[PDB]
């Protein structure tokens, strides 16, 4: 599900699903 | 950054995992 254009909340949701318990940082510049 | 690699271009699992903790 990750090999597409992921924007806005959809990108943050992908990070949440992929990273799991590792957490993530979202820095849109 | 992530927007340029995953929103304005096509994302990848490698790129997403670059931002995991």
Curated annotation (Swiss-Prot), chain A:
Phenotype for residue 24 to S: In HPRI; Los-Angeles
Protein name: Insulin B chain
Effect the entry attributes to changing residue 22 to Q: In MODY10; reduces binding affinity to INSR; reduces biological activity; reduces folding properties
Gene this chain is encoded by: INS
From Swiss-Prot, chain B:
Protein name: Insulin A chain
Gene expressing this chain: INS
Organism from which the protein derives: Homo sapiens (Human)
Span within the parent record: 90 to 109 of 110
Cysteines joined through disulfide linkages: 6-11
